[PDB]
Amino acid sequence: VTAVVQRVEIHKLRQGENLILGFSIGGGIDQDPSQNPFSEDKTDKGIYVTRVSEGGPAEIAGLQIGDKIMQVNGWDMTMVTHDQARKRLTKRSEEVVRLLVTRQSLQKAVQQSML
Template structure:
């Protein structure tokens, strides 16, 4: 079960593969940046009991997806739990490390868990 998972313990769940290719955009200072179009919350360094979204574990969750963004186009949804990005385990990661890893790569090959999805 992907939700209510304790970091460091074995987990069996259905994972959905999502490939997100970032798009070039311009930031507020006129610099070219790679944009993915989503925000995350959570991490092993966060207290999930204080999550405004009501998450039940320390996983990395998608908390916002911007309309018409690469994230929206590839099918990422709010409340998706990110299990892995480019082969890197996101079940045992701090919030800061997850943000840094996502920012670093132009293409994100993710495995996510989605509540209510029990088979493909």
């Protein structure tokens, strides 16, 4: 890709025997892009963060509502169904979810790098 991507490592919350993300997603190749307020258009099938739990591990790690998730623990998230995205995010054996995300505001980090 050409866009600026940020690595966001989130240690999942724990509740009993469950691990909780502390954030929610929308999108997927099998979903109607219009159900997702963050899809750029009818052709945008990406996975986007739709909610971020206040004070949770996602918020602390730098995750923002509207962020586009490009990768989850090494797995590409650019062209997957919503269910496939959900699975990569909720692996019980993975206490940490390492996301590669992007947002409009990160693009200037490149300007600043140059001066």
